[PDB]
Design a protein around this ligand. Structure first.
Ligand SMILES: [Mg+2]
Ligand SMILES: [Mg+2]
Ligand SMILES: [Mg+2]
Ligand SMILES: [Mg+2]
Ligand SMILES: [Mg+2]
Ligand SMILES: [Mg+2]
Ligand SMILES: [Mg+2]
Ligand SMILES: [Mg+2]
Ligand SMILES: [Mg+2]
Ligand SMILES: [Mg+2]
Ligand SMILES: [Mg+2]
Ligand SMILES: [Mg+2]
Ligand SMILES: [Mg+2]
Ligand SMILES: [Mg+2]
Ligand SMILES: [Mg+2]
Ligand SMILES: [Mg+2]
Ligand SMILES: [Mg+2]
Ligand SMILES: [Mg+2]
Ligand SMILES: [Mg+2]
Ligand SMILES: [Mg+2]
Ligand SMILES: [Mg+2]
Ligand SMILES: [Mg+2]
Ligand SMILES: [Mg+2]
Ligand SMILES: [Mg+2]
Ligand SMILES: [Mg+2]
Ligand SMILES: [Mg+2]
Ligand SMILES: [Mg+2]
Ligand SMILES: [Mg+2]
Ligand SMILES: [Mg+2]
Ligand SMILES: [Mg+2]
Ligand SMILES: [Mg+2]
Ligand SMILES: [Mg+2]
Ligand SMILES: [Mg+2]
Ligand SMILES: [Mg+2]
Ligand SMILES: [Mg+2]
Ligand SMILES: [Mg+2]
Ligand SMILES: [Mg+2]
Ligand SMILES: [Mg+2]
Ligand SMILES: [Mg+2]
Ligand SMILES: [Mg+2]
Ligand SMILES: [Mg+2]
Ligand SMILES: [Mg+2]
Ligand SMILES: [Mg+2]
Ligand SMILES: [Mg+2]
Ligand SMILES: [Mg+2]
Ligand SMILES: [Mg+2]
Ligand SMILES: [Mg+2]
Ligand SMILES: [Mg+2]
Ligand SMILES: [Mg+2]
Ligand SMILES: [Mg+2]
Ligand SMILES: [Mg+2]
Ligand SMILES: [Mg+2]
Ligand SMILES: [Mg+2]
Ligand SMILES: [Mg+2]
Ligand SMILES: [Mg+2]
Ligand SMILES: [Mg+2]
Ligand SMILES: [Mg+2]
Ligand SMILES: [Mg+2]
Ligand SMILES: [Mg+2]
Ligand SMILES: [Mg+2]
Ligand SMILES: [Mg+2]
Ligand SMILES: [Mg+2]
Ligand SMILES: [Mg+2]
Ligand SMILES: [Mg+2]
Ligand SMILES: [Mg+2]
Ligand SMILES: [Mg+2]
Ligand SMILES: [Mg+2]
Ligand SMILES: [Mg+2]
Ligand SMILES: [Mg+2]
Ligand SMILES: [Mg+2]
Ligand SMILES: [Mg+2]
Ligand SMILES: [Mg+2]
Ligand SMILES: [Mg+2]
Ligand SMILES: [Mg+2]
Ligand SMILES: [Mg+2]
Ligand SMILES: [Mg+2]
Ligand SMILES: [Mg+2]
Ligand SMILES: [Mg+2]
Ligand SMILES: [Mg+2]
Ligand SMILES: [Mg+2]
Ligand SMILES: [Mg+2]
Ligand SMILES: [Mg+2]
Ligand SMILES: [Mg+2]
Ligand SMILES: [Mg+2]
Ligand SMILES: [Mg+2]
Ligand SMILES: [Mg+2]
Ligand SMILES: [Mg+2]
Ligand SMILES: [Mg+2]
Ligand SMILES: [Mg+2]
Ligand SMILES: [Mg+2]
Ligand SMILES: [Mg+2]
Ligand SMILES: [Mg+2]
Ligand SMILES: [Mg+2]
Ligand SMILES: [Mg+2]
Ligand SMILES: [Mg+2]
Ligand SMILES: [Mg+2]
Ligand SMILES: [Mg+2]
Ligand SMILES: [Mg+2]
Ligand SMILES: [Mg+2]
Ligand SMILES: [Mg+2]
Ligand SMILES: [Mg+2]
Ligand SMILES: [Mg+2]
Ligand SMILES: [Mg+2]
Ligand SMILES: [Mg+2]
Ligand SMILES: [Mg+2]
Ligand SMILES: [Mg+2]
Ligand SMILES: [Mg+2]
Ligand SMILES: [Mg+2]
Ligand SMILES: [Mg+2]
Ligand SMILES: [Mg+2]
Ligand SMILES: [Mg+2]
Ligand SMILES: [Mg+2]
Ligand SMILES: [Mg+2]
Ligand SMILES: [Mg+2]
Ligand SMILES: [Mg+2]
Ligand SMILES: [Mg+2]
Ligand SMILES: [Mg+2]
Ligand SMILES: [Mg+2]
Ligand SMILES: [Mg+2]
Ligand SMILES: [Mg+2]
Ligand SMILES: [Mg+2]
Ligand SMILES: [Mg+2]
Ligand SMILES: [Mg+2]
Ligand SMILES: [Mg+2]
Ligand SMILES: [Mg+2]
Ligand SMILES: [Mg+2]
Ligand SMILES: [Mg+2]
Ligand SMILES: [Zn+2]
Lengths: 37, 140, 204, 174, 12
RNA sequence: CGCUGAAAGCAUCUAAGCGGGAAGCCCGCCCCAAGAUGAGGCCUCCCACGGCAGCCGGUAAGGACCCGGGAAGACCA
RNA sequence: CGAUGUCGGCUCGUCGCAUCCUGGGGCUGAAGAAGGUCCCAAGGGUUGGGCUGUUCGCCCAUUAAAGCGGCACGCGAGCUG
RNA sequence: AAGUCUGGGCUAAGUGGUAAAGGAUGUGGCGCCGCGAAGACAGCCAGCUGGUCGAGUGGCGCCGCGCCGAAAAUGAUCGGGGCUUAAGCCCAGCGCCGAAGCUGCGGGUCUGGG
């Protein structure tokens, strides 16, 4: 998981979801998984 | 003429079903009743309020996410002795304290203020031991 | 949960499988139940046990009353065991078989006014290199203007010992029912002649 | 573009009783209650159940599709019922039944014995296939995930507990 | 860290 | 980290709901503790005194004083 | 400035967490073992020596680890000097 | 001490009640194009075209209010309790409370006019 102030889509298959008051970015590629913070 | 000051009268007893009422908005009225500020002969330097019996305090109700976010706090005087207790848990363990803390913070500080708090009888569960006083059902 | 009153009698080692095993001998039996605490009456469950026979010349009327309502000889010591309800009217050492692990409570030896070194295992001061009358003193006890006070709980000199102490999970090495002895492996709070409580262990 | 207003076929013959905030779906395989938002109104038509929302704002739209599917899944549950299949891949790895219970031998120093909760039935055809079956779709799915959790698919080898229809994507070893 | 005295050592 | 699942026919651990998950948090262990003036509870004992929620006087059950001591202790306890 | 005693050590702690270890995680150019990197976590723990007044630092031998800070650069009506 | 006052609206963070670049399918309200009953977007059956689904769908910008970014040392807290169609925020009202200011009544002293 990456934890950043700037979470962005990295590849066309990335997906910005919002869960529990937090912006995540989940994806098929494990490297792309992000959490804001 | 000098302002009327009442001699000691028989204090009224009162019953309130806390069930489904919003914690704070009920506490306020209980406090007023405790101060006797509903009585036209109110006097600020003696206890002449009502006695207030509250039932179903375990079913007090509350808005927002306060059930898991509202923190009750206790400092013991010892290093690291700050205890934090959530609403949810207070209800789960000592539910009457929830409403008791609320009213207490809305009564005056000082000796009289402590005496008024004493006339507040609060119970979890529909019943109360004070049928002896036969307290008047109040809708609030 | 089960328990018994008793007095600490002394220490020895016995031999068991080519091993020396340190033991404390305890005289536990026999303890008559003189009251039972019940949820409908007392709100909790326990047994008030009596221990050691007393000269009726020394037992007063409110005390006599209590004993008689239980049909019991005047006893010197009255003490409860919680969540213990023996089928009998009398509790003896036989409720403990060897191999069981037990919890022993007694009154620790009193050191009276104890310095900070004995009490709290402080380091004290140097005995040379300029040390000035501080060889057994406790050092600093605080900070400065912030917080400008001393913590509740600050370890300081003061009375030490003569307090309730429980040591836990002691082995029952043997039991001699004909003499009301219990043999427990290791050390037990307090002096010989000291009253001790023996309960089945709370450890697992 | 819509789930909540798409009607729910009810097979002959399962019954759908409607109470405030819940619906009871009884059928050939058993019964199960579905809690429903007191804001949504579920309707009992002929051979069909429908769900209607009281406005077109966000919260009501969000409950709508949810409520419809909750009931649709309940319906299929008591008629066809649900199941999920688990493939066990890896050499020493195998599974077997012991009474109602399922015993995984999946490479630990011990075997794992999964007890089935109420409404759940275990099956072992081959020693390498397991079927978790029941009328509660969320419950079956749960237990299935549970079984899989015991020994997830390795990332390097085609070894472990797999979902049927789960693709074996692996990364190279040194 | 070594900083300089601001106050002398106390004399009789 | 998931199950079920819309808004968004797909997808989504979440918006309804439900699981898993730390030496950490609550209980559990040990010790203090009803001055907890919110001063609690049980067992047992005394008792229905003479004089004009008060006073004085003798008692009850009980306590203290004094004394012999004490792995209790600075005195006190 | 009609006085707020000043570095270092000792003794005694206590808090923070930007976590040295231990516990729990995600990603890894993660085969295993062992690392990296980020997240959660402050409950406990965080050794003995040589040199220097030293704080610090370097070195020896270990270790799960040999954490960084605040408390008048914590603490001289507590000692040292 | 005086409104749990009235009417319209936003906010779900206890935001209100302590901060920045910057990041975001948070929410509400404007605006602009792209596409589509010559059948679009999604799903399922093929090769950016096809087929049944039968509707809406995708991108850009602006406005309000919120979210993250947000770690520090004794015990916490918006002054406290407590507050969620509000006891928060925006717009518009009526009424009250509130000072040794203003008024009423009485008194003093100086100054000025009688
Ligand atoms: Mg990161
Ligand atoms: Mg970036
Ligand atoms: Mg892109
Ligand atoms: Mg969560
Ligand atoms: Mg995805
Ligand atoms: Mg109310
Ligand atoms: Mg309300
Ligand atoms: Mg009222
Ligand atoms: Mg409510
Ligand atoms: Mg809540
Ligand atoms: Mg503590
Ligand atoms: Mg501690
Ligand atoms: Mg703290
Ligand atoms: Mg503690
Ligand atoms: Mg505490
Ligand atoms: Mg005041
Ligand atoms: Mg033997
Ligand atoms: Mg009981
Ligand atoms: Mg009990
Ligand atoms: Mg029991
Ligand atoms: Mg004892
Ligand atoms: Mg000495
Ligand atoms: Mg000593
Ligand atoms: Mg000691
Ligand atoms: Mg030393
Ligand atoms: Mg020494
Ligand atoms: Mg000297
Ligand atoms: Mg000298
Ligand atoms: Mg000396
Ligand atoms: Mg000082
Ligand atoms: Mg202070
Ligand atoms: Mg003592
Ligand atoms: Mg102890
Ligand atoms: Mg005990
Ligand atoms: Mg052992
Ligand atoms: Mg052992
Ligand atoms: Mg539609
Ligand atoms: Mg799964
Ligand atoms: Mg799947
Ligand atoms: Mg390769
Ligand atoms: Mg001098
Ligand atoms: Mg998944
Ligand atoms: Mg799914
Ligand atoms: Mg679906
Ligand atoms: Mg939810
Ligand atoms: Mg929500
Ligand atoms: Mg959970
Ligand atoms: Mg799981
Ligand atoms: Mg441990
Ligand atoms: Mg005790
Ligand atoms: Mg007591
Ligand atoms: Mg008492
Ligand atoms: Mg007690
Ligand atoms: Mg109190
Ligand atoms: Mg009383
Ligand atoms: Mg008492
Ligand atoms: Mg008794
Ligand atoms: Mg008499
Ligand atoms: Mg008389
Ligand atoms: Mg007498
Ligand atoms: Mg004596
Ligand atoms: Mg002694
Ligand atoms: Mg003596
Ligand atoms: Mg004396
Ligand atoms: Mg000066
Ligand atoms: Mg001076
Ligand atoms: Mg001065
Ligand atoms: Mg040194
Ligand atoms: Mg020293
Ligand atoms: Mg030294
Ligand atoms: Mg030393
Ligand atoms: Mg401190
Ligand atoms: Mg520390
Ligand atoms: Mg420190
Ligand atoms: Mg860092
Ligand atoms: Mg290091
Ligand atoms: Mg680790
Ligand atoms: Mg770690
Ligand atoms: Mg890692
Ligand atoms: Mg590895
Ligand atoms: Mg490698
Ligand atoms: Mg892994
Ligand atoms: Mg390798
Ligand atoms: Mg990095
Ligand atoms: Mg780093
Ligand atoms: Mg870092
Ligand atoms: Mg952290
Ligand atoms: Mg820690
Ligand atoms: Mg701490
Ligand atoms: Mg520390
Ligand atoms: Mg050293
Ligand atoms: Mg040398
Ligand atoms: Mg050295
Ligand atoms: Mg050095
Ligand atoms: Mg350095
Ligand atoms: Mg140097
Ligand atoms: Mg060098
Ligand atoms: Mg290691
Ligand atoms: Mg070192
Ligand atoms: Mg270092
Ligand atoms: Mg340090
Ligand atoms: Mg410092
Ligand atoms: Mg400084
Ligand atoms: Mg200093
Ligand atoms: Mg220092
Ligand atoms: Mg100082
Ligand atoms: Mg000095
Ligand atoms: Mg010094
Ligand atoms: Mg001083
Ligand atoms: Mg000292
Ligand atoms: Mg209103
Ligand atoms: Mg937030
Ligand atoms: Mg707030
Ligand atoms: Mg805030
Ligand atoms: Mg900004
Ligand atoms: Mg963008
Ligand atoms: Mg929007
Ligand atoms: Mg916006
Ligand atoms: Mg299509
Ligand atoms: Mg925040
Ligand atoms: Mg933090
Ligand atoms: Mg702070
Ligand atoms: Mg309004
Ligand atoms: Mg004036
Ligand atoms: Mg005038
Ligand atoms: Mg003048
Ligand atoms: Mg004139
Ligand atoms: Zn991606």
């Amino acid at each position: 998981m990456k934890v950043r102030a700037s979470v962005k889509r990295i590849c066309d298959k990335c997906k910005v979801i919002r869960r529990h008051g937090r912006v995540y970015v989940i994806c098929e590629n494990p490297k792309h998984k992000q959490r804001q913070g | 003429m000098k302002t009327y000051v009442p001699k000691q009268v028989e204090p009224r007893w009162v019953l309130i079903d806390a069930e489904g009422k919003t914690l704070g908005r009920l506490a306020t009225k209980i406090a007023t009743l405790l101060r006797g500020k509903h009585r036209p002969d109110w006097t600020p330097n003696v206890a002449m309020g009502d006695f207030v019996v509250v039932v179903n305090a375990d079913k007090i109700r509350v808005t927002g996410k306060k059930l898991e976010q509202k923190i009750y706090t206790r400092y013991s005087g010892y290093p690291g002795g700050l205890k934090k207790i959530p609403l949810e848990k207070m209800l789960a363990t000592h539910p009457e304290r929830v409403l008791e803390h609320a009213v207490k913070g809305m009564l005056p500080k000082g000796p009289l203020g402590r005496r008024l708090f004493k006339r507040l009888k609060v119970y979890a569960g529909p019943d109360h031991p004070h049928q002896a006083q036969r307290p008047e059902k109040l809708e609030v | 949960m089960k328990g018994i009153l008793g007095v600490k009698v002394g220490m020895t080692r016995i031999f068991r499988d080519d091993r020396a095993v340190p033991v404390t001998v305890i005289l536990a039996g026999p303890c008559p139940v003189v009251q039972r605490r019940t949820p409908e009456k007392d709100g909790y469950t326990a047994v008030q046990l009596g221990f050691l026979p007393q000269n009726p010349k020394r037992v007063n009327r409110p005390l006599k009353g209590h004993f008689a309502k239980a049909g019991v000889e005047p006893v010197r010591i009255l003490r409860e065991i919680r969540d213990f309800n023996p089928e009998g009217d009398t509790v003896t050492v036989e409720i403990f078989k060897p191999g069981e692990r037990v919890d022993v409570t007694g009154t620790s030896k009193g050191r009276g006014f104890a310095g900070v070194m004995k009490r709290w295992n402080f380091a004290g001061g140097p005995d040379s290199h300029g040390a000035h009358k501080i060889h057994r003193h406790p050092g600093s006890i605080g900070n400065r203007k912030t917080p400008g006070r001393v913590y509740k709980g600050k370890k300081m000199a003061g009375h030490y010992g003569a307090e309730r102490v429980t040591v836990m999970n002691l082995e029952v090495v043997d039991v001699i029912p004909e003499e009301n002895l219990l043999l427990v492996k290791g050390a037990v709070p307090g002096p010989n002649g000291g009253l001790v409580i023996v309960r089945e262990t709370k450890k697992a | 573009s819509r789930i909540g207003r798409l009607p729910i076929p009810v097979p002959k013959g399962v019954s759908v009783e409607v109470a405030p905030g819940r619906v009871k779906v009884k059928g050939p395989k058993g019964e199960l209650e579905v809690p429903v938002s007191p804001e949504m109104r579920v309707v009992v038509e002929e051979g069909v159940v429908r769900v209607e929302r009281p406005s077109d704002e966000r919260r009501h739209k969000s409950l709508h599709g949810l409520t419809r599917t909750l009931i649709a899944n309940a319906v299929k549950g008591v008629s066809e019922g649900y199941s999920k299949e688990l493939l066990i891949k890896g050499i020493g790895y195998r599974a077997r039944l012991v009474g109602r219970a399922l015993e995984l031998t999946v490479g630990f120093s011990h075997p794992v014995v999964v007890e089935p909760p109420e409404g759940i039935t275990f099956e072992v055809p081959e020693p390498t296939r397991v079927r978790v079956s029941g009328i509660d779709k969320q419950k079956v799915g749960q237990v299935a995930a549970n079984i899989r959790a015991i020994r997830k698919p390795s990332a390097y080898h085609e070894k472990g507990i797999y979902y049927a229809g789960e693709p074996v994507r692996l990364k190279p070893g040194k | 860290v070594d900083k300089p005295d601001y106050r002398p050592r106390p004399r009789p």
